[PDB]
Design an enzyme around this catalytic site. Structure first.
Site, PDB file in Angstrom:
ATOM      1  CG  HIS A  61       7.419  -3.489   0.695  1.00 64.49           C
ATOM      2  ND1 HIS A  61       7.826  -4.108  -0.346  1.00 64.49           N
ATOM      3  CD2 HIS A  61       7.125  -4.614   1.545  1.00 64.49           C
ATOM      4  CE1 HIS A  61       7.843  -5.281  -0.265  1.00 64.49           C
ATOM      5  NE2 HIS A  61       7.329  -5.908   0.670  1.00 64.49           N
ATOM      6  CG  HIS A  91       2.843   2.871   6.416  1.00 66.90           C
ATOM      7  ND1 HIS A  91       1.791   2.156   6.846  1.00 66.90           N
ATOM      8  CD2 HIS A  91       2.646   3.233   5.102  1.00 66.90           C
ATOM      9  CE1 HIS A  91       0.942   2.415   5.968  1.00 66.90           C
ATOM     10  NE2 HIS A  91       1.325   2.668   4.809  1.00 66.90           N
ATOM     11  CG  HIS A  93       3.248   5.223   0.958  1.00 69.31           C
ATOM     12  ND1 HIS A  93       3.363   4.089   0.199  1.00 69.31           N
ATOM     13  CD2 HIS A  93       2.276   5.359   1.952  1.00 69.31           C
ATOM     14  CE1 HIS A  93       2.646   3.302   0.845  1.00 69.31           C
ATOM     15  NE2 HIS A  93       2.053   4.045   1.770  1.00 69.31           N
ATOM     16  CD  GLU A 103       0.605   4.953  -1.380  1.00 76.03           C
ATOM     17  OE1 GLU A 103      -0.154   4.474  -0.448  1.00 76.03           O
ATOM     18  OE2 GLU A 103       1.369   4.141  -2.223  1.00 76.03           O
ATOM     19  CG  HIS A 116      -0.823   5.895   4.365  1.00 68.38           C
ATOM     20  ND1 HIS A 116      -0.702   4.859   3.276  1.00 68.38           N
ATOM     21  CD2 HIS A 116      -1.402   7.113   4.011  1.00 68.38           C
ATOM     22  CE1 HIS A 116      -0.926   5.583   2.361  1.00 68.38           C
ATOM     23  NE2 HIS A 116      -1.487   6.690   2.497  1.00 68.38           N
ATOM     24  CB  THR A 195      -1.567   2.180  -1.252  1.00 66.64           C
ATOM     25  OG1 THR A 195      -0.933   2.105  -0.133  1.00 66.64           O
ATOM     26  CG2 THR A 195      -3.027   2.967  -0.791  1.00 66.64           C
TER      27      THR A 195
HETATM   28  C1  LIG Z   1      -3.735  -2.673   6.643  1.00 64.64           C
HETATM   29  C2  LIG Z   1      -2.661  -2.200   5.713  1.00 64.64           C
HETATM   30  C3  LIG Z   1      -1.817  -3.128   5.044  1.00 64.64           C
HETATM   31  C4  LIG Z   1      -0.989  -2.602   4.301  1.00 64.64           C
HETATM   32  C5  LIG Z   1      -0.032  -3.705   3.515  1.00 64.64           C
HETATM   33  C6  LIG Z   1      -0.993  -1.381   3.688  1.00 64.64           C
HETATM   34  C7  LIG Z   1      -1.931  -0.145   4.360  1.00 64.64           C
HETATM   35  C8  LIG Z   1      -2.743  -0.793   5.334  1.00 64.64           C
HETATM   36  S1  LIG Z   1      -2.043   1.332   3.667  1.00 64.64           S
HETATM   37  O1  LIG Z   1      -2.106   2.261   4.714  1.00 64.64           O
HETATM   38  O2  LIG Z   1      -2.969   1.306   2.607  1.00 64.64           O
HETATM   39  N1  LIG Z   1      -0.740   1.441   2.562  1.00 64.64           N
HETATM   40  C9  LIG Z   1       0.141   0.396   2.196  1.00 64.64           C
HETATM   41  O3  LIG Z   1       1.096   0.723   1.456  1.00 64.64           O
HETATM   42  N2  LIG Z   1      -0.047  -0.905   2.556  1.00 64.64           N
HETATM   43 ZN   LIG Z   2       0.484   3.240   3.101  1.00 61.55          ZN
END
Ligand SMILES: Cc1cc(C)c2c(c1)S(=O)(=O)NC(=O)N2
Ligand SMILES: [Zn+2]
Ligand SMILES: Cc1cc(C)c2c(c1)S(=O)(=O)NC(=O)N2
Ligand SMILES: Cc1cc(C)c2c(c1)S(=O)(=O)NC(=O)N2
Length: 257
Positions: A61, A91, A93, A103, A116, A195
């Site tokens: 992803h 990571h 997006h 986002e 993020h 998200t």
């Molecule tokens: C802790 C965390 C877990 C997941 C899957 C996340 C995020 C934080 S996140 O930063 O909200 N962005 C996202 O796409 N997936």
């Molecule tokens: Zn994210």
């Protein structure tokens, strides 16, 4: 099963994760003329000098850089936050084209990508417990626009060839995440969610006002990653962003005038 395609993308997620239609979902549009300056907010404290990166991985992803969070080595404090939050991973997006990919949006503007930096509240002891709490996580969101290169991102870009497909990981030690930050720590903040699935409503969002600039060549290399695994039909990893969600009964606060 979930993803970003027509048949498994954001409009489908509520079937497996009904919190997708919840009261504090992320991301949101940040309406800059409606966000209120809050003088009680404290300056953010981003203490990354002792950060210990471990691995970089394609999880199907996004791609993620992980950190040793077994001690207070890279922590976020202050701002709207109570207590100490440890950096676990970062990571991105991003989009298929430079006009989309973020986002969060700012007055409906979409940036080319969004970083993020994910941190968890040490009072809950581990990230699994933290995700079950309304104040368990603090995610620092940083916009990317295309212009000049970001030198502190190049080490990331140059290893992506080695994690092209889902499930691939590589050593990624000695990476300094301070090289991904803009000059200003001015920010907006609001209570929200992860998200992606499971969309848990456990995040204090801290979104920086100042974007970082990356080069077209840097973002192009993001777009060469694959959602698929090795030996499968290639599907480029692009447009791995969730659109803005209803603000509902929330107020976005600004740290700056
Ligand atoms: C802790 C965390 C877990 C997941 C899957 C996340 C995020 C934080 S996140 O930063 O909200 N962005 C996202 O796409 N997936
Ligand atoms: Zn994210
Ligand atoms: C066929 C296909 C197309 C897109 C955009 C996909 C997927 C398959 S997917 O790999 O099932 N997961 C995902 O995120 N996006
Ligand atoms: C608790 C937790 C849950 C999920 C689904 C996560 C993570 C933490 S994670 O490590 O932040 N990265 C990720 O991609 N998914």
């Amino acid at each position: 099963h979930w993803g970003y395609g027509k048949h498994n993308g954001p409009e489908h997620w509520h079937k497996d994760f009904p919190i997708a239609k919840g009261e504090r979902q992320s991301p949101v549009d940040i309406d800059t003329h409606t966000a209120k300056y809050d003088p009680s907010l404290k300056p953010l404290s981003v203490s990354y000098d002792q950060a210990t990166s471990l691995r970089i991985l394609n999880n199907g992803h996004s791609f993620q850089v992980t950190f040793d969070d077994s001690q207070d080595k890279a922590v976020l404090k202050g701002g709207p936050l109570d207590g100490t939050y440890r950096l676990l991973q970062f990571h991105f997006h991003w989009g298929s084209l430079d006009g989309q990919g973020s986002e969060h949006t700012v007055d409906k503007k979409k940036y080319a990508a969004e970083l993020h930096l994910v941190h968890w509240n040490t009072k809950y002891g581990d990230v699994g417990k933290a995700v079950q709490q309304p104040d368990g996580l603090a995610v620092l969101g940083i916009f990317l626009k295309v212009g000049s290169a970001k030198p502190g991102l190049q080490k990331v870009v140059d290893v992506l060839d080695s994690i092209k497909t889902e499930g691939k990981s590589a050593d990624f030690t000695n990476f300094d995440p301070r090289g991904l930050l803009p000059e200003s720590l001015d920010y907006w903040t609001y209570p929200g969610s992860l998200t992606t699935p499971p969309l848990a409503e456990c995040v204090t969002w801290i979104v920086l006002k100042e974007p970082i600039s990356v080069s077209s060549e840097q973002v192009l290399k993001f777009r060469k990653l694959n959602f698929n695994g090795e030996g499968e039909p290639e599907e480029l990893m692009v447009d791995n962003w969730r659109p803005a969600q209803p603000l509902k009964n929330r107020q976005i606060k600004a740290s700056f005038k």
